[PDB]
Every structure is written in C-alpha cells, then in structure tokens.
Amino acid sequence: MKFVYKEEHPFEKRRSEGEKIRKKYPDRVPVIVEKAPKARIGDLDKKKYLVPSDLTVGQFYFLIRKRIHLRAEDALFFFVNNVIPPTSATMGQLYQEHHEEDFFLYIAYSDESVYGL
Ligand code: NI
C-alpha cells in the first residue's frame, strides 16, 4: 500500500531519522501505522510510534484498538508487507524481518483480512 507518510517525507529524511532512532535507542522500534483508505473504520490519531522491541504484536494490537475505540469483537487486521503477523511475534522480530530501508517498520490496518493492500 502507499503510505501518506512516505508521500510527504522524502526518503533521505526518513532514513536519517530512522537511523538516528535506532542508534540512540537500540531497544526501540520506530513504526508508522496507517489505515488502508477503503477501510470503513476509525482513523488514527497518532501515526508514529517508538515501541519497545519486546512488545508483542498482540499488545500493540490492543493499544491501537483502544486508540481507535474498537473492541475484541470488531474486526481489525494488521498488515506488514501484506502479511498479517501473529500476535506472539515481538515488534523487534517484526522489525528485523520487515523494516524498510529508511529504518522504519510500516503497518497498514484494515477491517478485511484476506487481500493484500
Ligand atoms: Ni478516545
């Protein structure tokens, strides 16, 4: 999916920020989270997060659900390179496998699970 953040910040600047954050705070992972445009749910308040590497995907799901006022009963899916990661993965593992070359991890969220964004 295209991210508004990538459209509005040039690569070299994103990179410079990502590198710096990872050098300075090696136990944090910088993430950009955006809603798939057609998804008919709540938009996100904050798009940039610096999370603990040992935070789980399930925990981050709980945080984002709670920011957009969704309960366990509402569909919400995270997509990273079009893969929906397991709740047991840590954000640090996700970052290591799937960070972009600007040193940020990109998560797209939607209410549909089957199709790539
Ligand atoms: Ni609120």
Side-chain angles (χ1 to χ4, degrees):
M1 177 185 104
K2 286 306 178 208
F3 282 74
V4 168
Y5 195 81
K6 293 163 70 177
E7 297 184 333
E8 66 177 60
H9 300 85
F11 178 85
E12 179 98 322
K13 207 82 158 184
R14 294 187 334 246
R15 191 176 35 198
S16 58
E17 183 183 345
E19 275 195 70
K20 167 203 194 173
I21 290 176
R22 287 293 288 159
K23 110 180 152 332
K24 186 164 287 207
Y25 309 121
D27 280 314
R28 298 267 178 182
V29 165
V31 195
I32 302 302
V33 183
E34 292 186 14
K35 189 180 69 69
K38 302 180 176 157
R40 292 324 173 174
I41 59 170
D43 210 342
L44 252 185
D45 108 81
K46 158 181 178 55
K47 87 169 55 171
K48 181 164 72 178
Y49 304 67
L50 197 55
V51 308
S53 83
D54 58 353
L55 192 79
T56 77
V57 161
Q59 291 171 318
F60 191 57
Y61 260 121
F62 182 85
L63 296 165
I64 296 298
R65 282 169 165 291
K66 185 144 173 50
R67 297 190 79 89
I68 68 183
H69 306 160
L70 284 185
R71 301 184 167 166
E73 62 266 26
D74 300 302
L76 180 62
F77 305 102
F78 286 164
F79 286 83
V80 179
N81 290 324
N82 276 334
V83 179
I84 296 169
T87 56
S88 47
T90 61
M91 291 301 283
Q93 297 155 19
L94 190 50
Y95 180 96
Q96 294 203 310
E97 170 168 12
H98 293 299
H99 73 86
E100 292 198 2
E101 299 298 300
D102 64 0
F103 295 113
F104 279 82
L105 172 67
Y106 288 83
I107 301 185
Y109 76 87
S110 176
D111 57 337
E112 286 188 88
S113 55
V114 57
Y115 311 127
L117 301 175

